[PDB]
Paper text:
Peptide hormones, such as parathyroid hormone (PTH), neuropeptide Y (NPY), [name] (GCG) and secretin (SCT), which adopt α-helical structures on binding their receptors, play key roles in human biology and are well-established biomarkers in clinical care and biomedical research. We set out to develop general methods for designing proteins that bind peptides in helical conformations. We show that by extending RFdiffusion8 to enable binder design to flexible targets, and to refining input structure models by successive noising and denoising (partial diffusion), picomolar-affinity binders can be generated to helical peptide targets by either refining designs generated with other methods, or completely de novo starting from random noise distributions without any subsequent experimental optimization. The deep learning methods largely converged on the overall solution to the helical peptide-binding design problem—groove-shaped scaffolds with helices lining the binding site—that the human designers chose in the initial Rosetta parametric approaches.
As a first experimental test of partial diffusion, we started from our parametrically designed Inpainted binders to GCG (with 231 nM Kd) and NPY (with 3.5 µM affinity). Following partial noising and denoising, we identified diverse designs that in silico had substantially improved computational metrics compared to the starting design. The highest-affinity designs were expressed in E. coli and then purified, and their binding affinities were determined using FP to be 5.6 nM to NPY (top) and below the limit of detection in the picomolar range to GCG (bottom). To gain insight into the structural rearrangements generated by partial diffusion that contribute to the affinity increases, we solved the structures of the original Inpainted [name] and the partially diffused higher-affinity [name]. Both designs were very close to their design models. Subtle structural changes in the protein backbone between the original Inpainted design model and the partially diffused model are nearly perfectly recapitulated in the corresponding crystal structures. Alignment of the two crystal structures on the structurally conserved C-terminal residues (16–29) of GCG showed that in the partially diffused [name] a 2.7-Å shift towards the target in the binder backbone enables an isoleucine to fit into a pocket previously occupied by a phenylalanine side chain at position 13 (left inset).
Residue numbers in the entry:
A (entry chain B): 179 to 200
B (entry chain A): 3 to 169
The structure:
């Protein structure tokens, strides 16, 4: 109910990895 | 090289963010049970030590981002690197506000004061970055990066919504 996928640290890792590989 | 170094620092920032989160959620669980204050204070100390770590890593990220920019004077690389910085400061902002919530429950008034300063400083740095990033959006023609900007924007909105639900 409180959990946000956007606060997930793995998501942040995947977002960095995506952003870095653009 | 420094692009690897940026990613490596980012990994260390995300890892310290995770330590803040882990400590905060254990703190909240403990405070709702009525856990003894030494355990609550342990988790607050763990958040503070990880925050200190993140603050230093962001200084390294920042001084490394600057060298990569200006050496490259490339718009797409600058936009990439500012969006990484934009993400790292969001994670720092969340980490500050979570520690502030714990410090407030434990009544640690001096830590709350210091975290107030840190959150306004990160807000100010986030707004500076938004200004530079918005300028580069005009200048780059990579919609992948435009989607990446939209994503971190939606991250901060959700993070703010999450922070309001905690306090």
């Amino acid at each position: 109910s409180d959990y946000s996928k956007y606060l997930d640290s793995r998501r942040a890792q995947d977002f960095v990895q995506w952003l870095m590989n653009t | 090289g420094s692009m690897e170094k940026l990613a490596e620092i980012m990994q260390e920032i995300i890892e310290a963010y995770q330590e803040v989160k882990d400590a905060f959620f254990k703190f909240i669980k403990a405070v709702h049970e009525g856990a003894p204050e030494e355990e609550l204070k342990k988790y607050l100390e763990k958040m503070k030590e990880a925050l200190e770590k993140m603050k230093e890593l962001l200084e390294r990220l920042e001084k490394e981002a600057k060298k990569v920019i200006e050496e490259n004077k490339d718009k797409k690389l600058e936009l990439k690197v500012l969006l990484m910085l934009r993400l790292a400061y969001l994670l720092l902002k969340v980490s500050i506000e979570l520690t502030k919530i714990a410090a407030e429950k434990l009544g640690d008034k001096e830590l709350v004061e210091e975290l107030e300063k840190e959150s306004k400083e990160v807000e100010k740095k986030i707004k500076e970055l938004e200004e530079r990033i918005k300028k580069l959006l005009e200048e780059v023609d990579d919609e992948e990066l435009k989607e990446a900007y939209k994503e971190v924007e939606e991250m901060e909105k959700e993070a703010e919504k999450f922070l309001e639900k905690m306090r």
